[PDB]
């Protein structure tokens, strides 16, 4: 708002890491459970349990 025309925002350290992280693995946690669901339905031999 106050430095937009001439100044450019830049980030260093942790801040650069956080802004550019675009981190994956949000789905990972769900995937872990899905994996568990499958290894279990093969032990149990029943999809429901």
């Amino acid at each position: 708002q106050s430095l937009g025309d001439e100044y450019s925002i830049a980030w260093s350290g942790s801040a650069y890491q956080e802004v550019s992280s675009k981190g994956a693995g949000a789905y990972a946690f769900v995937l872990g459970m899905i994996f568990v669901f499958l290894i279990l339905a093969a032990q149990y031999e029943r999809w429901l349990m």
Binding site: L31, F35, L38, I39, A41, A42, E45, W47
Partner: protein, 50 residues
């Protein structure tokens, strides 16, 4: 006999296949897409001034 353990347990077989498929889609998303593998000879340039 390995074949028949599966035949007696369809769910077990299905589970193994599903796991293979899932790992497959995770892998597909992760993999880079290029036109060709690297076939280009690597090049180093030495420059001098007289």
């Amino acid at each position: 006999m390995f074949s028949k353990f599966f035949i007696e347990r369809p769910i077990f077989a299905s589970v193994v296949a599903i796991i293979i498929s899932i790992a497959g889609i995770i892998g597909l998303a992760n993999l880079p897409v290029e036109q060709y593998p690297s076939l280009t000879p690597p090049t180093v340039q030495v420059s001098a001034t007289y």
